[PDB]
């Protein structure tokens, strides 16, 4: 699959942040932020 990068939109359906990034807010949609 093709996962998003840092600074992209991540949804709680099938498009989450696979690399070392988190989904914020992510309720339901979020963004891939670095922590």
mmCIF file with all atom_site columns, N, CA, C and O in Angstrom:
data_model
loop_
_atom_site.group_PDB
_atom_site.id
_atom_site.type_symbol
_atom_site.label_atom_id
_atom_site.label_alt_id
_atom_site.label_comp_id
_atom_site.label_asym_id
_atom_site.label_entity_id
_atom_site.label_seq_id
_atom_site.pdbx_PDB_ins_code
_atom_site.Cartn_x
_atom_site.Cartn_y
_atom_site.Cartn_z
_atom_site.occupancy
_atom_site.B_iso_or_equiv
_atom_site.pdbx_formal_charge
_atom_site.auth_seq_id
_atom_site.auth_comp_id
_atom_site.auth_asym_id
_atom_site.auth_atom_id
_atom_site.pdbx_PDB_model_num
ATOM 1   N N  . UNK A 1 1  ? 0.815   -1.215 0.000  1.00 0.00 ? 1  UNK A N  1
ATOM 2   C CA . UNK A 1 1  ? 0.000   0.000  0.000  1.00 0.00 ? 1  UNK A CA 1
ATOM 3   C C  . UNK A 1 1  ? 0.852   1.270  0.000  1.00 0.00 ? 1  UNK A C  1
ATOM 4   O O  . UNK A 1 1  ? 2.060   1.220  0.258  1.00 0.00 ? 1  UNK A O  1
ATOM 5   N N  . UNK A 1 2  ? 0.207   2.404  -0.291 1.00 0.00 ? 2  UNK A N  1
ATOM 6   C CA . UNK A 1 2  ? 0.879   3.700  -0.330 1.00 0.00 ? 2  UNK A CA 1
ATOM 7   C C  . UNK A 1 2  ? 0.437   4.563  0.850  1.00 0.00 ? 2  UNK A C  1
ATOM 8   O O  . UNK A 1 2  ? -0.616  5.213  0.813  1.00 0.00 ? 2  UNK A O  1
ATOM 9   N N  . UNK A 1 3  ? 1.250   4.536  1.909  1.00 0.00 ? 3  UNK A N  1
ATOM 10  C CA . UNK A 1 3  ? 0.986   5.299  3.131  1.00 0.00 ? 3  UNK A CA 1
ATOM 11  C C  . UNK A 1 3  ? 1.433   6.765  2.997  1.00 0.00 ? 3  UNK A C  1
ATOM 12  O O  . UNK A 1 3  ? 2.394   7.056  2.282  1.00 0.00 ? 3  UNK A O  1
ATOM 13  N N  . UNK A 1 4  ? 0.729   7.708  3.691  1.00 0.00 ? 4  UNK A N  1
ATOM 14  C CA . UNK A 1 4  ? 1.055   9.153  3.660  1.00 0.00 ? 4  UNK A CA 1
ATOM 15  C C  . UNK A 1 4  ? 2.374   9.495  4.372  1.00 0.00 ? 4  UNK A C  1
ATOM 16  O O  . UNK A 1 4  ? 2.900   8.683  5.141  1.00 0.00 ? 4  UNK A O  1
ATOM 17  N N  . UNK A 1 5  ? 2.890   10.698 4.100  1.00 0.00 ? 5  UNK A N  1
ATOM 18  C CA . UNK A 1 5  ? 4.126   11.156 4.720  1.00 0.00 ? 5  UNK A CA 1
ATOM 19  C C  . UNK A 1 5  ? 3.870   12.182 5.809  1.00 0.00 ? 5  UNK A C  1
ATOM 20  O O  . UNK A 1 5  ? 2.744   12.297 6.299  1.00 0.00 ? 5  UNK A O  1
ATOM 21  N N  . UNK A 1 6  ? 4.915   12.935 6.182  1.00 0.00 ? 6  UNK A N  1
ATOM 22  C CA . UNK A 1 6  ? 4.811   13.968 7.222  1.00 0.00 ? 6  UNK A CA 1
ATOM 23  C C  . UNK A 1 6  ? 4.169   15.246 6.662  1.00 0.00 ? 6  UNK A C  1
ATOM 24  O O  . UNK A 1 6  ? 4.670   15.832 5.696  1.00 0.00 ? 6  UNK A O  1
ATOM 25  N N  . UNK A 1 7  ? 3.058   15.655 7.285  1.00 0.00 ? 7  UNK A N  1
ATOM 26  C CA . UNK A 1 7  ? 2.341   16.852 6.858  1.00 0.00 ? 7  UNK A CA 1
ATOM 27  C C  . UNK A 1 7  ? 1.229   16.554 5.864  1.00 0.00 ? 7  UNK A C  1
ATOM 28  O O  . UNK A 1 7  ? 0.944   17.372 4.985  1.00 0.00 ? 7  UNK A O  1
ATOM 29  N N  . UNK A 1 8  ? 0.608   15.379 6.009  1.00 0.00 ? 8  UNK A N  1
ATOM 30  C CA . UNK A 1 8  ? -0.481  14.951 5.130  1.00 0.00 ? 8  UNK A CA 1
ATOM 31  C C  . UNK A 1 8  ? -1.698  14.521 5.957  1.00 0.00 ? 8  UNK A C  1
ATOM 32  O O  . UNK A 1 8  ? -1.585  14.293 7.165  1.00 0.00 ? 8  UNK A O  1
ATOM 33  N N  . UNK A 1 9  ? -2.857  14.406 5.291  1.00 0.00 ? 9  UNK A N  1
ATOM 34  C CA . UNK A 1 9  ? -4.107  14.014 5.952  1.00 0.00 ? 9  UNK A CA 1
ATOM 35  C C  . UNK A 1 9  ? -4.191  12.494 6.137  1.00 0.00 ? 9  UNK A C  1
ATOM 36  O O  . UNK A 1 9  ? -3.980  11.730 5.191  1.00 0.00 ? 9  UNK A O  1
ATOM 37  N N  . UNK A 1 10 ? -4.503  12.083 7.370  1.00 0.00 ? 10 UNK A N  1
ATOM 38  C CA . UNK A 1 10 ? -4.640  10.670 7.714  1.00 0.00 ? 10 UNK A CA 1
ATOM 39  C C  . UNK A 1 10 ? -6.024  10.398 8.296  1.00 0.00 ? 10 UNK A C  1
ATOM 40  O O  . UNK A 1 10 ? -6.422  11.022 9.284  1.00 0.00 ? 10 UNK A O  1
ATOM 41  N N  . UNK A 1 11 ? -6.750  9.461  7.678  1.00 0.00 ? 11 UNK A N  1
ATOM 42  C CA . UNK A 1 11 ? -8.100  9.110  8.126  1.00 0.00 ? 11 UNK A CA 1
ATOM 43  C C  . UNK A 1 11 ? -8.103  7.806  8.928  1.00 0.00 ? 11 UNK A C  1
ATOM 44  O O  . UNK A 1 11 ? -7.197  6.979  8.789  1.00 0.00 ? 11 UNK A O  1
ATOM 45  N N  . UNK A 1 12 ? -9.136  7.643  9.763  1.00 0.00 ? 12 UNK A N  1
ATOM 46  C CA . UNK A 1 12 ? -9.291  6.452  10.615 1.00 0.00 ? 12 UNK A CA 1
ATOM 47  C C  . UNK A 1 12 ? -9.993  5.293  9.874  1.00 0.00 ? 12 UNK A C  1
ATOM 48  O O  . UNK A 1 12 ? -10.455 4.333  10.504 1.00 0.00 ? 12 UNK A O  1
ATOM 49  N N  . UNK A 1 13 ? -10.046 5.383  8.538  1.00 0.00 ? 13 UNK A N  1
ATOM 50  C CA . UNK A 1 13 ? -10.691 4.358  7.717  1.00 0.00 ? 13 UNK A CA 1
ATOM 51  C C  . UNK A 1 13 ? -9.668  3.404  7.095  1.00 0.00 ? 13 UNK A C  1
ATOM 52  O O  . UNK A 1 13 ? -9.664  2.212  7.416  1.00 0.00 ? 13 UNK A O  1
ATOM 53  N N  . UNK A 1 14 ? -8.801  3.926  6.204  1.00 0.00 ? 14 UNK A N  1
ATOM 54  C CA . UNK A 1 14 ? -7.789  3.098  5.529  1.00 0.00 ? 14 UNK A CA 1
ATOM 55  C C  . UNK A 1 14 ? -6.524  3.892  5.160  1.00 0.00 ? 14 UNK A C  1
ATOM 56  O O  . UNK A 1 14 ? -5.603  3.338  4.545  1.00 0.00 ? 14 UNK A O  1
ATOM 57  N N  . UNK A 1 15 ? -6.463  5.172  5.548  1.00 0.00 ? 15 UNK A N  1
ATOM 58  C CA . UNK A 1 15 ? -5.303  6.010  5.231  1.00 0.00 ? 15 UNK A CA 1
ATOM 59  C C  . UNK A 1 15 ? -4.631  6.573  6.509  1.00 0.00 ? 15 UNK A C  1
ATOM 60  O O  . UNK A 1 15 ? -4.732  7.776  6.792  1.00 0.00 ? 15 UNK A O  1
ATOM 61  N N  . UNK A 1 16 ? -3.955  5.704  7.322  1.00 0.00 ? 16 UNK A N  1
ATOM 62  C CA . UNK A 1 16 ? -3.245  6.124  8.536  1.00 0.00 ? 16 UNK A CA 1
ATOM 63  C C  . UNK A 1 16 ? -1.761  6.417  8.259  1.00 0.00 ? 16 UNK A C  1
ATOM 64  O O  . UNK A 1 16 ? -1.268  6.122  7.167  1.00 0.00 ? 16 UNK A O  1
ATOM 65  N N  . UNK A 1 17 ? -1.054  6.986  9.249  1.00 0.00 ? 17 UNK A N  1
ATOM 66  C CA . UNK A 1 17 ? 0.374   7.291  9.095  1.00 0.00 ? 17 UNK A CA 1
ATOM 67  C C  . UNK A 1 17 ? 1.224   6.060  9.447  1.00 0.00 ? 17 UNK A C  1
ATOM 68  O O  . UNK A 1 17 ? 1.351   5.694  10.622 1.00 0.00 ? 17 UNK A O  1
ATOM 69  N N  . UNK A 1 18 ? 1.785   5.415  8.410  1.00 0.00 ? 18 UNK A N  1
ATOM 70  C CA . UNK A 1 18 ? 2.622   4.219  8.586  1.00 0.00 ? 18 UNK A CA 1
ATOM 71  C C  . UNK A 1 18 ? 4.061   4.569  9.032  1.00 0.00 ? 18 UNK A C  1
ATOM 72  O O  . UNK A 1 18 ? 4.606   3.864  9.885  1.00 0.00 ? 18 UNK A O  1
ATOM 73  N N  . UNK A 1 19 ? 4.715   5.652  8.480  1.00 0.00 ? 19 UNK A N  1
ATOM 74  C CA . UNK A 1 19 ? 6.087   6.041  8.888  1.00 0.00 ? 19 UNK A CA 1
ATOM 75  C C  . UNK A 1 19 ? 6.112   6.596  10.336 1.00 0.00 ? 19 UNK A C  1
ATOM 76  O O  . UNK A 1 19 ? 5.061   6.607  10.983 1.00 0.00 ? 19 UNK A O  1
ATOM 77  N N  . UNK A 1 20 ? 7.295   7.043  10.893 1.00 0.00 ? 20 UNK A N  1
ATOM 78  C CA . UNK A 1 20 ? 7.377   7.577  12.279 1.00 0.00 ? 20 UNK A CA 1
ATOM 79  C C  . UNK A 1 20 ? 6.605   8.901  12.506 1.00 0.00 ? 20 UNK A C  1
ATOM 80  O O  . UNK A 1 20 ? 7.169   9.897  12.977 1.00 0.00 ? 20 UNK A O  1
ATOM 81  N N  . UNK A 1 21 ? 5.306   8.887  12.179 1.00 0.00 ? 21 UNK A N  1
ATOM 82  C CA . UNK A 1 21 ? 4.430   10.048 12.361 1.00 0.00 ? 21 UNK A CA 1
ATOM 83  C C  . UNK A 1 21 ? 3.117   9.622  13.013 1.00 0.00 ? 21 UNK A C  1
ATOM 84  O O  . UNK A 1 21 ? 2.714   8.458  12.917 1.00 0.00 ? 21 UNK A O  1
ATOM 85  N N  . UNK A 1 22 ? 2.459   10.578 13.670 1.00 0.00 ? 22 UNK A N  1
ATOM 86  C CA . UNK A 1 22 ? 1.188   10.331 14.352 1.00 0.00 ? 22 UNK A CA 1
ATOM 87  C C  . UNK A 1 22 ? 0.041   11.070 13.653 1.00 0.00 ? 22 UNK A C  1
ATOM 88  O O  . UNK A 1 22 ? 0.274   12.029 12.916 1.00 0.00 ? 22 UNK A O  1
ATOM 89  N N  . UNK A 1 23 ? -1.188  10.618 13.901 1.00 0.00 ? 23 UNK A N  1
ATOM 90  C CA . UNK A 1 23 ? -2.370  11.226 13.297 1.00 0.00 ? 23 UNK A CA 1
ATOM 91  C C  . UNK A 1 23 ? -3.044  12.199 14.270 1.00 0.00 ? 23 UNK A C  1
ATOM 92  O O  . UNK A 1 23 ? -3.695  11.783 15.237 1.00 0.00 ? 23 UNK A O  1
ATOM 93  N N  . UNK A 1 24 ? -2.860  13.499 14.010 1.00 0.00 ? 24 UNK A N  1
ATOM 94  C CA . UNK A 1 24 ? -3.439  14.555 14.841 1.00 0.00 ? 24 UNK A CA 1
ATOM 95  C C  . UNK A 1 24 ? -4.178  15.574 13.956 1.00 0.00 ? 24 UNK A C  1
ATOM 96  O O  . UNK A 1 24 ? -3.595  16.083 12.995 1.00 0.00 ? 24 UNK A O  1
ATOM 97  N N  . UNK A 1 25 ? -5.471  15.892 14.270 1.00 0.00 ? 25 UNK A N  1
ATOM 98  C CA . UNK A 1 25 ? -6.221  15.313 15.414 1.00 0.00 ? 25 UNK A CA 1
ATOM 99  C C  . UNK A 1 25 ? -6.567  13.821 15.236 1.00 0.00 ? 25 UNK A C  1
ATOM 100 O O  . UNK A 1 25 ? -6.289  13.012 16.127 1.00 0.00 ? 25 UNK A O  1
ATOM 101 N N  . UNK A 1 26 ? -7.171  13.472 14.087 1.00 0.00 ? 26 UNK A N  1
ATOM 102 C CA . UNK A 1 26 ? -7.536  12.085 13.809 1.00 0.00 ? 26 UNK A CA 1
ATOM 103 C C  . UNK A 1 26 ? -8.873  11.682 14.412 1.00 0.00 ? 26 UNK A C  1
ATOM 104 O O  . UNK A 1 26 ? -9.045  10.531 14.822 1.00 0.00 ? 26 UNK A O  1
ATOM 105 N N  . UNK A 1 27 ? -9.815  12.634 14.463 1.00 0.00 ? 27 UNK A N  1
ATOM 106 C CA . UNK A 1 27 ? -11.146 12.379 15.027 1.00 0.00 ? 27 UNK A CA 1
ATOM 107 C C  . UNK A 1 27 ? -12.253 13.077 14.204 1.00 0.00 ? 27 UNK A C  1
ATOM 108 O O  . UNK A 1 27 ? -12.695 14.175 14.568 1.00 0.00 ? 27 UNK A O  1
ATOM 109 N N  . UNK A 1 28 ? -12.710 12.476 13.059 1.00 0.00 ? 28 UNK A N  1
ATOM 110 C CA . UNK A 1 28 ? -12.225 11.185 12.518 1.00 0.00 ? 28 UNK A CA 1
ATOM 111 C C  . UNK A 1 28 ? -10.940 11.331 11.695 1.00 0.00 ? 28 UNK A C  1
ATOM 112 O O  . UNK A 1 28 ? -10.091 10.436 11.695 1.00 0.00 ? 28 UNK A O  1
ATOM 113 N N  . UNK A 1 29 ? -10.815 12.472 10.998 1.00 0.00 ? 29 UNK A N  1
ATOM 114 C CA . UNK A 1 29 ? -9.650  12.761 10.155 1.00 0.00 ? 29 UNK A CA 1
ATOM 115 C C  . UNK A 1 29 ? -8.548  13.452 10.954 1.00 0.00 ? 29 UNK A C  1
ATOM 116 O O  . UNK A 1 29 ? -8.820  14.113 11.965 1.00 0.00 ? 29 UNK A O  1
ATOM 117 N N  . UNK A 1 30 ? -7.308  13.286 10.493 1.00 0.00 ? 30 UNK A N  1
ATOM 118 C CA . UNK A 1 30 ? -6.172  13.891 11.163 1.00 0.00 ? 30 UNK A CA 1
ATOM 119 C C  . UNK A 1 30 ? -5.028  14.198 10.217 1.00 0.00 ? 30 UNK A C  1
ATOM 120 O O  . UNK A 1 30 ? -5.200  14.172 8.996  1.00 0.00 ? 30 UNK A O  1
ATOM 121 N N  . UNK A 1 31 ? -3.858  14.497 10.793 1.00 0.00 ? 31 UNK A N  1
ATOM 122 C CA . UNK A 1 31 ? -2.652  14.816 10.017 1.00 0.00 ? 31 UNK A CA 1
ATOM 123 C C  . UNK A 1 31 ? -1.458  14.033 10.585 1.00 0.00 ? 31 UNK A C  1
ATOM 124 O O  . UNK A 1 31 ? -1.450  13.675 11.764 1.00 0.00 ? 31 UNK A O  1
ATOM 125 N N  . UNK A 1 32 ? -0.453  13.779 9.739  1.00 0.00 ? 32 UNK A N  1
ATOM 126 C CA . UNK A 1 32 ? 0.751   13.049 10.153 1.00 0.00 ? 32 UNK A CA 1
ATOM 127 C C  . UNK A 1 32 ? 1.790   14.015 10.740 1.00 0.00 ? 32 UNK A C  1
ATOM 128 O O  . UNK A 1 32 ? 2.519   14.690 10.001 1.00 0.00 ? 32 UNK A O  1
ATOM 129 N N  . UNK A 1 33 ? 1.830   14.088 12.080 1.00 0.00 ? 33 UNK A N  1
ATOM 130 C CA . UNK A 1 33 ? 2.762   14.969 12.782 1.00 0.00 ? 33 UNK A CA 1
ATOM 131 C C  . UNK A 1 33 ? 3.906   14.177 13.410 1.00 0.00 ? 33 UNK A C  1
ATOM 132 O O  . UNK A 1 33 ? 3.764   12.983 13.688 1.00 0.00 ? 33 UNK A O  1
ATOM 133 N N  . UNK A 1 34 ? 5.040   14.856 13.630 1.00 0.00 ? 34 UNK A N  1
ATOM 134 C CA . UNK A 1 34 ? 6.223   14.232 14.227 1.00 0.00 ? 34 UNK A CA 1
ATOM 135 C C  . UNK A 1 34 ? 6.222   14.414 15.759 1.00 0.00 ? 34 UNK A C  1
ATOM 136 O O  . UNK A 1 34 ? 5.977   15.516 16.261 1.00 0.00 ? 34 UNK A O  1
ATOM 137 N N  . UNK A 1 35 ? 6.490   13.318 16.474 1.00 0.00 ? 35 UNK A N  1
ATOM 138 C CA . UNK A 1 35 ? 6.522   13.328 17.941 1.00 0.00 ? 35 UNK A CA 1
ATOM 139 C C  . UNK A 1 35 ? 7.811   12.698 18.473 1.00 0.00 ? 35 UNK A C  1
ATOM 140 O O  . UNK A 1 35 ? 8.557   13.397 19.192 1.00 0.00 ? 35 UNK A O  1
#
